[PDB]
Design a protein around this ligand. Structure first.
Ligand SMILES: CN(Cc1cnc2nc(N)nc(N)c2n1)c1ccc(C(=O)N[C@@H](CCC(=O)O)C(=O)O)cc1
Length: 947
């Protein structure tokens, strides 16, 4: 078998994940296929995780049925995992208490600089001890966290597998009456969507009691430093809760109505791609073009508002750390107290540790718990029924299509000012403290120091909103300008491009690639850019105070570039492995429920359980590597993130004769916030480069094959088709320019007022002549028609002056007035005349509207009869000379074909009919008959010499 190195591995080797080093060496240069993944632990099998939960549930059902109450499933999980969760909670409490001691010991180092004496050896040792104590909370938070996180993540897959095991076990005991209601789709959905919500619940389950505790623990510490002025900092942070939720209820609505404009358009596409040979033959491209162009404008106008709302939300999330500090400190100063550099940065650190945690971790645990409870209720109600007895080019082509190169310089200059203001607003307070500490009653005027601070506070918000708005607009304009190019490039492709590519591929592209281009790209781009810009500012602030922290920065930054690549090279296969191991489980589940009555004949219902367990163990193995490979990188990242802080603190302490308290506090208060932003910035690039593939495959289009232009300046006479004379010569045809033939050298010439017919068996080149004079694939061979040719004329002025009767009639979703005449070139009464001349006016007045009656789903309300008859009515109203009749019959012998053939008898007056015959008797009193066998003709004038 495949033993895993997770076991038989001592301590101090599982905190750094040292047992996963060899696997990387295999994934770096060999592309492991399926047999380089380790097995699962003996306590992670399906049969072990399912039987104990089944026993607990069977005991709970009896316990809750003997006494008159309802059986509950939520208790059967707490009766099992309570010990594990409360054991894990110890480290949660430890790491939550460790995040409060750091700002307490941060303020004790600045106090040493505030009272400095160059001849003193007792306080330096105390400062070193304080630094050593502070240098360990970071290590505790950075190193020992990734094992507890892996454990709390693994604590969910066990339940996820145990639920599916008993679900499948129950799915084989359903009666014939209970199965008549329950479909296979809802069962595979319950097993495919409702059980996947148990993976992210245990991660956010510990915030419901750690939020309010930490809030009070920090609020109690602010009173000892500043006083009442902390309330002015806590009164704003609460207001952010109802404001960010109410507007949420305003956003979701704007997301729903847009769907109404998104699906319908797609539906229209499903009717233009299926039937190109009819739309292109009738020259009806402009109608569908105008019908499609109108919906995209409304879709963009509805998307812009939601984009602006999301941009405003992000701008409010960016610069929310400046209002609280400004308010609390102007309140603290206006009361009559003196500002010092010992409490400012401590309060800043406390506020920054509180607000993010609260406003990002509290409103999500409730959603997670609600989804989990809904899923658990569904699964419980299900089990209670009775039983039986890329590259730089991909970015350049995507960015340069949005705006000119001036807007890019403008947005760069706009992005490179918000961070400068963000840093200067906090530097001004350090300058104020340093200027105040140098006094000996010669007080400081508040006007200047309070006006500069307000200006620096307002500029930050302004430059934070403008950048987001501009970025969102520029990135939406790109999709707006690419969708067009896609449409007018795909609309002009020849029939050879549609006869080989499936419709589902094109529809899937047009839907999901444009959805990705419109919805999630600008948000992720802006978030990544903001999180990346937030780190260079911290690095520059750290460097500008101590210029000697630029020497180790190069070795600390060189390692990351290689580490990211060395990780991705082997991490870019776990997703494929997981999907390939996950799909067969659903496949087997869906295919095993149909042939179920034969599994009851031979009473073997436990072998299928073992097969299901074996199928799920592969997905379990493929999922076990994901968490470990994801945690392998965070430890090495946090190592550098903590070494940076250690170096900063110690190098700043060992230079206590050059610097002062304000700037050491400033440099120390920023280094404690890098660990989260670095992780977020590293994470966002993954999704960016993952979703750029849709952009790249969108740009794959917009440059395809193209037929001849629609029209030239070679205008034919306005009365060109006055007489039907079609000559021929030895023409050879090939669909592809280098494939086989389907037809060979039809040489003839058709007279005017002549009813010519062709006799042949299906497959000998009989159904390809309509593709010749319609030039669907421009061949060699010069075809003269009425003093002009068929090659030096545009495609529209050649197919419009010709009529065609299709084999199988097609109808589009619209009005009866538009289906017979999209481009209005006639009056009102002529439509009634042409429709009664073909003898159908029952259905119209049997219906109310009878002129604007919309159809539905390809007009299934009608039959082949009136469909063929309305195609005949189109041929009637066309008012044309050349008529090509095709015959592919599946209809019945009664009055339909008699009526249509009599109408083609008397209605058509002396107009050059070219007919294709499938039954030898449909030709009645023909004038010219040709027989076309397996590659040429034996043609004669009259049928009297044939037989
Ligand atoms: C706690 N937190 C949420 C978090 C952290 N910092 C923030 N910083 C800002 N400015 N805004 C936030 N939304 C924010 N959110 C985090 C922190 C790290 C990762 C993270 O990088 N996770 C990776 C681990 C790293 C990796 O595998 O590459 C993963 O496997 O999913 C996720 C969320």
């Amino acid at each position: 078998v495949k033993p895993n190195p997770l076991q038989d591995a001592n301590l101090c080797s599982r905190v750094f994940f040292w047992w996963l080093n060899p696997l990387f060496k295999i994934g770096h240069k060999r592309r492991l296929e399926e047999d380089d993944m380790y097995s699962v632990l003996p306590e992670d099998r399906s049969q072990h995780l399912g039987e104990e939960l089944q026993g607990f549930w069977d005991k709970e059902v009896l316990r809750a049925e003997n006494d008159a109450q309802k059986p509950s499933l939520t208790r059967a999980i707490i009766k099992c995992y309570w010990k594990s969760y409360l054991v894990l909670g110890i480290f949660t409490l430890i790491e939550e208490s460790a995040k409060v001691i750091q700002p307490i010991f941060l303020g004790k180092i600045i106090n040493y600089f505030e009272n400095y004496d160059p001849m003193d050896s007792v306080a330096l040792n105390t400062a070193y001890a304080y630094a050593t104590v502070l240098t360990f909370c970071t290590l505790i938070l950075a190193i020992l966290h990734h094992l507890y996180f892996y454990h709390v993540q693994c604590a969910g897959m066990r339940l996820r597998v145990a639920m599916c095991h008993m679900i499948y076990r129950k799915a084989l005991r359903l009666s014939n009456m209970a199965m008549g209601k329950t479909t296979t789709g809802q069962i595979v959905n319950l097993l495919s969507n409702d059980v996947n919500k148990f993976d992210q619940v245990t991660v956010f389950l510990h915030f419901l009691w750690a939020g309010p505790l930490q809030a009070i623990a920090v609020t109690a510490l602010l009173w000892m430093e500043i006083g009442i002025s902390c309330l002015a900092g806590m009164a704003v942070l609460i207001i952010l809760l109802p404001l960010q939720s109410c507007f949420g209820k305003l956003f979701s609505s704007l997301r729903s109505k847009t769907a109404t404009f998104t699906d319908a358009r797609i539906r229209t596409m499903n009717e233009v791609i299926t039937g190109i040979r009819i739309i292109k033959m009738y020259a009806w491209e402009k109608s569908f073009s105008n019908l499609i162009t109108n919906l995209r404008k409304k879709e963009i106008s509805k998307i812009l508002r939601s984009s602006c709302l999301r941009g405003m939300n992000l701008a409010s999330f960016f610069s929310a750390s400046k209002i609280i500090v400004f308010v609390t400190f102007t309140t603290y100063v206006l009361l009559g107290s003196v500002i010092t550099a010992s409490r400012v940065f401590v309060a800043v650190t406390l506020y920054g540790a509180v607000r993010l945690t609260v406003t990002l971790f509290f409103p999500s645990a409730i959603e997670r718990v609600s989804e989990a409870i809904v899923s658990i209720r569904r699964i419980q109600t299900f089990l209670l029924l009775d039983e039986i007895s890329v590259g730089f080019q991909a970015y350049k082509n995507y960015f340069r299509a949005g705006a000119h190169w001036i807007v890019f310089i403008f947005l760069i200059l706009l992005n490179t000012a918000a961070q400068v203001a963000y840093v200067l607003q906090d530097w001004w307070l350090s300058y104020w403290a340093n200027k105040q500490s140098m006094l000996n009653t010669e007080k400081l005027d508040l006007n200047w120091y309070l006006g500069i601070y307000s200006g620096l506070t307002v500029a930050t918000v302004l430059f934070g909103i403008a950048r987001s708005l501009l970025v969102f607009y520029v990135l939406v304009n790109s999709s707006q300008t690419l969708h067009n190019k896609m449409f007018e490039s795909i609309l002009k492709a020849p029939v050879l491009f549609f006869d080989r590519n499936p419709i589902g591929r094109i529809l899937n592209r047009f839907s999901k690639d444009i959805g990705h281009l419109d919805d999630l790209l600008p948000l992720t781009f802006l978030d990544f850019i903001q999180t990346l810009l937030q780190v260079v500012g911290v690095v520059s602030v750290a460097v500008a105070v101590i210029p000697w922290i630029a020497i180790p920065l190069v070795p600390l930054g060189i390692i990351f570039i290689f580490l990211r690549r060395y990780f991705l090279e082997t991490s870019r296969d776990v997703k494929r492995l997981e999907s390939t191991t996950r799909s067969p489980v659903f496949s087997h589940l869906s295919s095993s429920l149909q042939g179920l009555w034969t599994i009851r004949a031979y009473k073997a219902e436990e072998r299928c359980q073992e097969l299901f367990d074996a199928h799920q163990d592969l997905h379990s193995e493929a999922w076990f590597l994901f968490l470990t490979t994801s945690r392998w990188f965070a430890v090495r990242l946090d190592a550098i993130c903590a070494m940076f802080v250690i170096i900063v603190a110690f190098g700043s302490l060992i230079l206590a004769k050059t610097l002062d308290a304000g700037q050491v506090g400033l440099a120390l208060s920023y280094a404690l916030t890098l660990m989260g932003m670095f992780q977020w910035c590293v994470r966002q690039s993954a999704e960016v480069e993952n979703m750029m593939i849709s952009v790249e495959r969108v740009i794959e289009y917009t440059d395809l094959e193209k037929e001849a232009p629609w029209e030239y300046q070679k205008r034919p006479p306005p009365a060109w088709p006055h007489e039907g004379v079609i000559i021929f010569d030895n023409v050879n045809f090939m669909y592809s320019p280098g494939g086989p033939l389907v037809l060979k050298h039809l040489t003839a010439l058709i007279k005017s007022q002549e009813k010519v017919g062709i006799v042949g068996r299906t497959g000998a080149g009989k159904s390809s002549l309509i593709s010749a004079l319609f030039r669907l694939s421009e061949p060699e061979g010069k075809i003269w028609i009425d003093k002009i040719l068929t090659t030096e004329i545009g495609l529209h002025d050649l197919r419009k002056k010709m009529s065609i009767i299709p084999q199988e009639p097609v109808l589009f979703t619209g009005t009866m007035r538009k289906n017979l005449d999209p481009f209005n070139e006639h009056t009102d009464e002529e439509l009634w005349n042409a429709l009664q001349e073909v003898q159908l006016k029952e259905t119209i007045e049997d219906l109310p509207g009878k002129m604007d009656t919309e159809l539905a789903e390809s007009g299934s309300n009608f039959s082949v009869g009136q469909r063929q008859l309305v195609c005949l009515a189109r041929a009637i109203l066309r008012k044309n000379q050349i008529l090509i009749i095709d015959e592919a019959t599946a209809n019945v012998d009664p009055r339909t074909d008699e009526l249509i053939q009599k109408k083609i008898r008397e209605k058509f007056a002396h107009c050059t009919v070219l007919t294709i015959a499938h039954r030898l008797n449909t030709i009645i009193d023909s004038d010219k008959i040709m027989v076309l066998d397996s590659g040429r003709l034996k043609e004669y004038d009259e049928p009297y010499v044939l037989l």
